[PDB]
């Protein structure tokens, strides 16, 4: 089940920057 | 070590919200 835990929080990691990426791109797009 | 992991998930979550919540009112300012 660790293992599980440690697959979750890399993966919320990854899509949380994702989202930053995206932030990146809206908020460039503004102007 | 149970309760560590799962506090990073709990936080990470909670982060993920928020990020998700500032996108929504970006799209709405810049028409997507």
Same mark, same amino acid.
Request: aromatic content about 4%; charged content about 40%.
């Given at each position: 089940?660790? !293992?599980?835990? &440690?697959? !979750?929080? &890399? &993966? %919320? @990691?990854? *899509? +949380?920057?994702? %989202?930053? +990426? &995206?932030?990146?791109? %809206? !908020? *460039? @797009?503004?102007?």
């Amino acid at each position: 089940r660790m !293992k599980q835990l &440690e697959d !979750k929080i &890399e &993966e %919320l @990691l990854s *899509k +949380n920057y994702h %989202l930053e +990426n &995206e932030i990146a791109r %809206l !908020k *460039k @797009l503004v102007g």
